[PDB]
Amino acid sequence: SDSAINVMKWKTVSTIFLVVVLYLIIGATVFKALEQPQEISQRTTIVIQREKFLRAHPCVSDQELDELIQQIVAAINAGIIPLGASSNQVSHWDLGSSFFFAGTVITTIGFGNISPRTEGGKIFCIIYALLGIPLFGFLLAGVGDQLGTIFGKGIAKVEDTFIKWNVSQTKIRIISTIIFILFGCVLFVALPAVIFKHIEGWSALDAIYFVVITLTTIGFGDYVAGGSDIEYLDFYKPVVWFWILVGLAYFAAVLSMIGDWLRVIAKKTKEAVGEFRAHAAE
Amino acid sequence: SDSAINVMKWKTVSTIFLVVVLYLIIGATVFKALEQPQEISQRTTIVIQREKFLRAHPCVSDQELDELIQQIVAAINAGSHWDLGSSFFFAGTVITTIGFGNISPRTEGGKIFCIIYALLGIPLFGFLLAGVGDQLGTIFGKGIAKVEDTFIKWNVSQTKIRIISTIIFILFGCVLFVALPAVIFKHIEGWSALDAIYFVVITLTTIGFGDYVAGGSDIEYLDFYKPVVWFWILVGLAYFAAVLSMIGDWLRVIAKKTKEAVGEFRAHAAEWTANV
Numbered sequence: 259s260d261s262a263i264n265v266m267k268w269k270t271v272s273t274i275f276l277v278v279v280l281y282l283i284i285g286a287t288v289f290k291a292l293e294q295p296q297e298i299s300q301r302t303t304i305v306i307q308r309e310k311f312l313r314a315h316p317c318v319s320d321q322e323l324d325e326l327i328q329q330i331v332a333a334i335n336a337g338i339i340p341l342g343a344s345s346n347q348v349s350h351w352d353l354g355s356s357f358f359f360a361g362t363v364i365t366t367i368g369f370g371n372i373s374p375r376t377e378g379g380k381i382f383c384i385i386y387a388l389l390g391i392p393l394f395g396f397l398l399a400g401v402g403d404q405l406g407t408i409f410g411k412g413i414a415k416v417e418d419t420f421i422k423w424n425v426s427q428t429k430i431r432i433i434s435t436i437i438f439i440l441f442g443c444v445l446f447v448a449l450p451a452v453i454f455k456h457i458e459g460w461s462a463l464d465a466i467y468f469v470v471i472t473l474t475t476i477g478f479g480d481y482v483a484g485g486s487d488i489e490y491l492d493f494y495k496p497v498v499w500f501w502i503l504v505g506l507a508y509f510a511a512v513l514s515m516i517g518d519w520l521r522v523i524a525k526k527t528k529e530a531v532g533e534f535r536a537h538a539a540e
Numbered sequence: 541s542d543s544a545i546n547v548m549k550w551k552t553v554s555t556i557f558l559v560v561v562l563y564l565i566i567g568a569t570v571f572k573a574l575e576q577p578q579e580i581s582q583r584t585t586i587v588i589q590r591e592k593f594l595r596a597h598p599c600v601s602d603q604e605l606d607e608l609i610q611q612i613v614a615a616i617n618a619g620s621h622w623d624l625g626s627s628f629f630f631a632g633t634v635i636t637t638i639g640f641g642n643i644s645p646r647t648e649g650g651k652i653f654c655i656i657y658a659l660l661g662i663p664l665f666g667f668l669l670a671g672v673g674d675q676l677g678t679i680f681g682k683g684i685a686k687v688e689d690t691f692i693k694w695n696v697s698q699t700k701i702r703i704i705s706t707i708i709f710i711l712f713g714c715v716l717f718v719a720l721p722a723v724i725f726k727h728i729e730g731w732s733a734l735d736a737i738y739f740v741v742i743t744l745t746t747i748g749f750g751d752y753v754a755g756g757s758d759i760e761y762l763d764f765y766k767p768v769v770w771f772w773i774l775v776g777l778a779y780f781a782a783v784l785s786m787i788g789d790w791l792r793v794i795a796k797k798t799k800e801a802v803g804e805f806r807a808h809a810a811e812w813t814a815n816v
């Protein structure tokens with residue numbers, strides 16, 4: 259009965275797929291409901307800024323105007339400060355920023371603000387990730403273990419003081435998982451999001467949004483710690499490397515937990531549908 | 541002794557940590573070696589274009605140009621991008637963690653929902669991706685049973701056919717998931733052969749710089765293209781999922797052979813030295 263279970267497996271893969279299709283649909287509508295308006299109010303006002311110099315300088319080709327912008331945007335992807343008051347310019351591929359870049363590869367964050375333009379940079383980048391991603395896999399795992407055992411020692415002390423009359427074995431894990439979410443979200447989310455707000459100038463929401471986008475390895479790149487030129491004590495960046503190293507370890511378990519809650523809510527809903535069928539109006 | 545086992549673990553972590561830092565150092569110099577130049581040649585040519593525009597058109601004064609370039613910088617911070625299809629795309633880049641970032645929420649509430657969507661989305665997609673890979677891995681099992689019967693009744697027997705089989709998984713695998721889609725991307729997107737492959741790997745590894753996006757350029761796409769890319773991503777992520785894991789296990793073997801080759805080398809220092 260080898261196919262007995264494979265027939266059953268495909269039945270579970272297909273329902274998870276139809277539920278993933280439905281999760282993309284619900285989200286797809288909620289984002290354009292949130293973002294479609296601001297996009298329009300920003301295209302009407304940007305055309306208002308277009309005309310105020312479209313006919314403010316008729317002695318330009320006015321086709322090269324929309325062609326000029328192409329030369330800027332197309333050239334901004336690499337990072338360009340085309341200004342006359344700032345002809346001197348800081349590098350994006352210097353000693354520290356190309357060390358950053360390597361980090362954003364092996365950790366699959368890939369912010370993208372700085373990416374290779376040379377065919378060699380690309381070819382090396384493909385080799386670098388195909389090796390470096392697995393390699394960094396072991397480090398993050400060891401950093402998960404260590405960080406994990408440092409918590410086993412802490413709960414061995416918290417699960418002995420709260421041992422009062424009428425204690426249970428399986429219920430006390432509920433108390434455990436709560437302290438993991440609470441203390442975790444402080445050191446890896448709350449505390450570092452504050453330093454971001456003050457060092458990068460970001461808002462409270464923007465710093466948290468950066469933390470989540472970064473430590474889930476989505477890494478859009480719209481916000482990046484250490485991106486601007488401000489001052490960067492350089493006590494700053496090396497601490498961020500460590501935050502990433504341990505902050506990734508954290509979300510790895512957190513995300514993995516959230517999934518278990520999803521099998522369970524999946525079990526209790528699969529059986530609640532059996533109950534409902536089973537009674538269904540008397 | 542519990543603290544003795546933990547001392548063995550921290551010794552292991554600390555060495556893998558050093559290898560990672562030493563890997564980051566190498567990469568940093570090789571990228572700085574490859575990208576520093578093009579940055580300077582493109583910084584010199586963009587300064588030539590900036591006066592080349594003030595000279596060819598005396599129409600624009602120097603003071604106006606700076607105002608112009610400030611507005612374009614703002615346009616970068618906005619860009620339709622949030623239509624019925626792009627927002628579905630976006631949702632794709634979130635739950636897969638690829639996150640190209642060519643489209644990203646600007647609303648305060650779209651950022652909050654993106655946090656919620658991602659925390660619940662990423663785990664959900666993992667199950668999907670876990671079954672896909674499961675299926676895909678059994679489909680390839682029905683293929684190696686067929687292959688590990690026609691070759692294993694004859695020429696040199698087991699203990700080296702397991703290495704031939706994994707080359708089959710890598711040879712075809714690259715064809716269906718890397719090569720074939722890069723060919724389609726080349727013609728449909730206008731990307732060079734390298735740029736397409738570059739894209740394939742930076743996407744299917746969830747890196748997703750967003751410097752190349754399949755479907756992001758303004759062009760007429762057949763009705764059937766974007767849906768096939770989804771399926772590609774779906775099945776392609778599963779493939780690099782294992783591929784990245786194999787590479788991970790190859791490093792596990794090699795790292796042992798180098799740890800013991802260092803014991804040998806020391807060790808023939810050892811008894812070659814005791815020879816006085």
Ligand SMILES: CCCCCCCCCCCCC/C=C/[C@@H](O)[C@H](CO)NC(=O)CCCCCCCCCCCCCCC
Nearest residue numbers: 386389555559562563566567791794795796798799800802
């Ligand atoms: C593309 C960027 C270049 C990557 C360069 C990193 C190579 C690392 C240098 C090799 C030796 C590592 C230090 C030795 C540590 C040993 O005491 C220890 C056993 O005691 N071995 C390991 O921990 C296990 C460590 C084994 C891990 C080896 C990493 C595999 C890299 C292979 C790339 C080949 C390219 C050839 C260029 C030289």
Ligand SMILES: CS(=O)(=O)Nc1ccc(C(=O)NCc2ccc(Cl)cc2Cl)cc1
Nearest residue numbers: 350355358361362483484485495498499
């Ligand atoms: C705009 S720039 O690219 O030109 N300048 C820089 C930007 C960032 C950094 C840096 O080290 N940030 C901390 C860090 C480290 C590793 C990883 Cl994986 C992620 C992060 Cl956030 C340095 C220079």
Ligand SMILES: CS(=O)(=O)Nc1ccc(C(=O)NCc2ccc(Cl)cc2Cl)cc1
Nearest residue numbers: 621626629632633643754755756766769
């Ligand atoms: C400025 S835009 O936002 O309008 N550009 C777009 C670009 C691409 C697509 C799209 O669907 N691509 C296929 C695809 C699907 C899922 C995943 Cl995860 C990744 C990918 Cl590449 C839509 C819009």
Ligand SMILES: CCCCCCCCCCCCCCCC
Nearest residue numbers: 277280281284285527528531657
């Ligand atoms: C934040 C977005 C929430 C999206 C959650 C979708 C819920 C879908 C529930 C589907 C239940 C199917 C039950 C099938 C059991 C046999």
Ligand SMILES: [K+]
Nearest residue numbers: 370479641750
């Ligand atoms: K970007």
Ligand SMILES: [K+]
Nearest residue numbers: 368476477639
């Ligand atoms: K990314």
Ligand SMILES: [K+]
Nearest residue numbers: 366475637746
């Ligand atoms: K991942």
Ligand SMILES: [K+]
Nearest residue numbers: 367638746747
């Ligand atoms: K990513």
Ligand SMILES: [K+]
Nearest residue numbers: 366475637746
């Ligand atoms: K990722």
Ligand SMILES: [K+]
Nearest residue numbers: 370640641749
């Ligand atoms: K990106």
